[PDB]
Amino acid sequence: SFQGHGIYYIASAYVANTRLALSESPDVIISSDAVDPLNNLWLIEPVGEADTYTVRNAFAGSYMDLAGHAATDGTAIIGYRPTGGDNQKWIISQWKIKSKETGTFVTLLNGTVVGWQNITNNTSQNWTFQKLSQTGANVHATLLACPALRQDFKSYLSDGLYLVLTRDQISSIWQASGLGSTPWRSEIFDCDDFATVFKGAVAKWGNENFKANGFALLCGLMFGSKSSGAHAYNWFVERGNFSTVTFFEPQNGTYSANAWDYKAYFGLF
Amino acid sequence: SFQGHGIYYIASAYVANTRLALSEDSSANKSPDVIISSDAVDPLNNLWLIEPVGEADTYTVRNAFAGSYMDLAGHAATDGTAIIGYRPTGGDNQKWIISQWKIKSKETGTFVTLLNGTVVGWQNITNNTSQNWTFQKLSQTGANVHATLLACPALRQDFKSYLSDGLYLVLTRDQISSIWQASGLGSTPWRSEIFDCDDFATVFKGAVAKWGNENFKANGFALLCGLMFGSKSSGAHAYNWFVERGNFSTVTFFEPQNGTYSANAWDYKAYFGLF
Ligand SMILES: *[C@@H](C(=O)O)[C@H](O)C(=O)N[C@@H](CC(C)C)C(=O)NCCCCNC(N)=[NH2+]
Ligand SMILES: *[C@@H](C(=O)O)[C@H](O)C(=O)N[C@@H](CC(C)C)C(=O)NCCCCNC(N)=[NH2+]
Ligand SMILES: OC[C@H]1O[C@@H](O)[C@H](O)[C@@H](O)[C@H]1O
Ligand SMILES: OC[C@H]1O[C@@H](O)[C@H](O)[C@@H](O)[C@H]1O
Ligand SMILES: [Ca+2]
Ligand SMILES: [Ca+2]
Ligand SMILES: [Ca+2]
Ligand SMILES: [Ca+2]
């Protein structure tokens, strides 16, 4: 559901398996949900006015814009440089997406994405929003409710809004990192290094792939311990259940639900 | 001075400006020689990782760069026997008794000697100082750096830190800067959240770790590269930190956005450190 400030898929309610992306001025286009190209991610940021936001392509950096400010039925919805204009402010209410400037609506036509006056005989102006982000407070609270913490656990965070990546994305970053073909070596490249390097790899991949600012990629680092010893590893929350912390071994790219029995004493994200 | 387990330059006390390094040249039938090296340059193969082997004053002496062990060729006690770098064997001709300084082969009782120059084993010499060496410690233990960190003036009351490794190499500024230059951080634009101070500091920290992995074939130590989050009344910032070779008690701060060093951490006071 739409919940204000966040990163979302914007899906048509009118036809199945259809969501918004930006062409490669670029048009806002329909996109199949069988694929997950990064230009389907929309960073929705409040502007102060009730239920009013900018809607920004995270990948391309462009802003959803009603072309030429035109109120005319069938005016293109495009991606544009930021202008401060009212044709880049969108009233999202319950869901429809209404231009502040014209009062025309983002509409799926025929298909193409356009501005149109209110339509009441079909659902072509109705949209569903799947939240893909967590605030820093969201993740902090999840982290603290995690059952795999040592009693002295302390955590620190760096950013106020996070994209939650898919496993496909995390694993692609990990494959590209070269860590899986890096031999473990005592001190010089041991668990702390794998976990630190991998967190950095995720950050670099974000920088390479997203032209928008105002959000970070969630990639947690933990130090933890158990009776046999102590270990460094990574962690995440997942899209299907944001309240669950999942663990990741940067030496071999595997996930664990219970952190290999380690109880974290330090968390960074 | 020699202080047991650690990483050191081993310099001749017989002639100035001269320390030990390992040759980069070898062949099927020739091991790399331990050689003399000018202290006007700082090639990584001048670094020696000296590790106790559980006998009084006895150590392996490993080239941090090449991974090779200082080895008395052929176990020979004969004067003028080559001192080489060899794969680890566990043999007594790779074990060295270091006493107050001289370096004596456990196998032969002969001493590492600067001859003419070349580096050879030789019986005890009393009419010159060619068997005398100085050791400059370039490493700190985890406990050493923690103490240093706790005694510095740049921490908040609530500061917590977390230690990663046991034995650290302390890098030079030239080395830190060369890693930083190679990272491309200096030409990466700052962008809020997506690539901001936290990312510069974390990514640089990882850059140092990869540089260590890629340039040192020995194991059993890490490179010191601290991460700090700190604040002051005007906002919060992430940055890196180190200790100085000239004074291991001095914490120096490093800005990974532009490669600059600061003695005062730009007035930030740390709440979090990782090293
Ligand atoms: C982890 C691995 O490669 O599996 C590697 O053994 C390692 O570094 N282990 C650690 C702790 C990780 C850094 C979490 C360890 O067991 N000890 C060294 C770190 C210092 C411990 N903390 C203090 N204050 N002594
Ligand atoms: C630092 C910079 O680029 O100079 C950048 O502003 C930044 O990341 N600042 C941080 C703190 C550093 C990581 C030390 C920051 O203040 N981020 C805000 C985090 C949001 C905290 N939220 C909650 N819920 N506690
Ligand atoms: O060409 C499309 C552009 O048209 C301009 O008139 C407008 O100010 C922009 O926000 C963008 O819509
Ligand atoms: O050729 C040099 C080698 O000779 C062998 O006899 C010895 O076992 C090795 O330690 C190395 O010294
Ligand atoms: Ca940040
Ligand atoms: Ca390490
Ligand atoms: Ca370690
Ligand atoms: Ca960040």
Side-chain angles (χ1 to χ4, degrees), chain A residues 54 63-65 69 80-89 101:
Chain A
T54 51
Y63 286 81
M64 185 170 286
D65 178 293
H69 314 254
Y80 206 64
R81 60 199 179 263
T83 58
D86 288 347
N87 66 320
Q88 307 187 339
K89 288 183 174 70
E101 187 165 0

Side-chain angles (χ1 to χ4, degrees), chain A residues 90-157:
Chain A
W90 300 97
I91 303 164
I92 299 168
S93 269
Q94 56 176 338
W95 309 88
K96 304 186 78 179
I97 303 171
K98 186 178 73 177
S99 169
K100 181 181 159 195
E101 187 165 0
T102 60
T104 65
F105 297 93
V106 175
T107 304
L108 178 51
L109 185 68
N110 300 314
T112 57
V113 185
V114 308
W116 206 275
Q117 66 178 287
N118 189 34
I119 295 169
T120 61
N121 65 353
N122 73 44
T123 64
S124 65
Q125 307 180 323
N126 296 341
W127 303 88
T128 67
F129 286 83
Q130 173 176 358
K131 190 175 75 180
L132 309 173
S133 56
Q134 293 284 271
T135 65
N138 286 156
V139 181
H140 184 81
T142 293
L143 233 191
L144 298 193
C146 175
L149 301 184
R150 217 171 68 172
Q151 181 68 14
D152 57 351
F153 181 80
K154 269 295 324 176
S155 64
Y156 306 90
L157 58 146

Side-chain angles (χ1 to χ4, degrees), chain A residues 12-229:
Chain A
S12 182
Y14 180 59
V15 290
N17 304 105
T18 293
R19 69 196 170 190
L20 301 185
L22 192 75
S23 56
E24 310 186 309
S25 290
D27 293 297
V28 172
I29 59 170
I30 66 172
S31 173
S32 171
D33 70 9
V35 289
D36 201 24
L38 297 180
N39 62 3
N40 71 10
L41 303 169
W42 299 95
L43 171 55
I44 301 184
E45 295 169 296
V47 295
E49 312 173 43
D51 304 309
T52 305
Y53 306 87
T54 51
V55 178
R56 190 189 194 180
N57 197 257
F59 176 81
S62 311
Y63 286 81
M64 185 170 286
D65 178 293
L66 186 65
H69 314 254
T72 311
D73 284 345
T75 301
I77 306 302
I78 65 174
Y80 206 64
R81 60 199 179 263
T83 58
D86 288 347
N87 66 320
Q88 307 187 339
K89 288 183 174 70
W90 300 97
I91 303 164
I92 299 168
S93 269
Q94 56 176 338
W95 309 88
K96 304 186 78 179
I97 303 171
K98 186 178 73 177
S99 169
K100 181 181 159 195
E101 187 165 0
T102 60
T104 65
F105 297 93
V106 175
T107 304
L108 178 51
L109 185 68
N110 300 314
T112 57
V113 185
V114 308
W116 206 275
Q117 66 178 287
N118 189 34
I119 295 169
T120 61
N121 65 353
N122 73 44
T123 64
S124 65
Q125 307 180 323
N126 296 341
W127 303 88
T128 67
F129 286 83
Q130 173 176 358
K131 190 175 75 180
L132 309 173
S133 56
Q134 293 284 271
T135 65
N138 286 156
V139 181
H140 184 81
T142 293
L143 233 191
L144 298 193
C146 175
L149 301 184
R150 217 171 68 172
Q151 181 68 14
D152 57 351
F153 181 80
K154 269 295 324 176
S155 64
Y156 306 90
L157 58 146
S158 65
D159 296 286
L161 190 62
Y162 290 99
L163 176 65
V164 182
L165 300 171
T166 71
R167 293 198 188 189
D168 285 344
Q169 290 159 340
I170 296 162
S171 299
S172 74
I173 295 164
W174 186 79
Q175 292 287 341
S177 72
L179 297 164
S181 60
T182 307
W184 181 97
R185 296 201 291 146
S186 180
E187 310 228 311
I188 196 66
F189 207 79
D190 60 342
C191 56
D192 54 89
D193 300 295
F194 285 89
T196 297
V197 169
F198 184 60
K199 179 172 171 48
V202 170
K204 287 193 310 192
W205 183 88
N207 178 60
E208 285 159 11
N209 282 285
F210 300 104
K211 293 173 63 56
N213 70 349
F215 72 107
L217 310 192
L218 178 67
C219 183
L221 168 76
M222 268 169 185
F223 293 184
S225 65
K226 60 191 192 184
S227 65
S228 62

Side-chain angles (χ1 to χ4, degrees), chain B residues 5-75:
Chain B
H5 191 200
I7 298 166
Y8 300 90
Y9 294 136
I10 305 176
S12 179
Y14 178 70
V15 293
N17 300 114
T18 301
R19 64 196 170 191
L20 292 187
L22 191 76
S23 185
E24 299 186 282
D25 288 324
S26 58
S27 72
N29 308 305
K30 153 95 172 49
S31 286
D33 300 313
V34 172
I35 60 171
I36 63 180
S37 182
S38 175
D39 74 7
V41 290
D42 199 25
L44 299 179
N45 61 18
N46 71 11
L47 299 165
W48 299 93
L49 171 60
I50 297 185
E51 299 167 291
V53 291
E55 322 172 38
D57 308 293
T58 305
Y59 300 94
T60 47
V61 176
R62 192 183 192 180
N63 192 259
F65 178 76
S68 302
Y69 288 76
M70 187 182 276
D71 169 302
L72 182 62
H75 314 251

Side-chain angles (χ1 to χ4, degrees), chain A residues 154 156 158-159 182 185-190 192-193 197 200 203 207 210-216 223 266 268, chain B residues 160 162 164-167 191-196 198-199 203 206 209 213 216-222 229 272 274:
Chain A
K154 269 295 324 176
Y156 306 90
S158 65
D159 296 286
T182 307
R185 296 201 291 146
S186 180
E187 310 228 311
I188 196 66
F189 207 79
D190 60 342
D192 54 89
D193 300 295
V197 169
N207 178 60
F210 300 104
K211 293 173 63 56
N213 70 349
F215 72 107
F223 293 184
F266 160 61
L268 175 68
Chain B
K160 307 281 185 271
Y162 302 95
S164 305
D165 298 297
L167 181 63
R191 308 191 282 129
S192 189
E193 289 75 37
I194 195 57
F195 210 83
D196 62 352
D198 62 86
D199 300 291
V203 170
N213 181 54
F216 299 102
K217 296 160 56 79
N219 72 357
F221 67 109
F229 288 3
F272 158 66
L274 172 67

Side-chain angles (χ1 to χ4, degrees), chain A residues 245-265:
Chain A
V245 181
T246 289
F247 306 91
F248 183 86
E249 173 47 71
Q251 286 186 52
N252 65 23
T254 63
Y255 301 80
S256 167
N258 83 321
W260 309 277
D261 294 317
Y262 289 102
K263 304 300 165 195
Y265 60 84

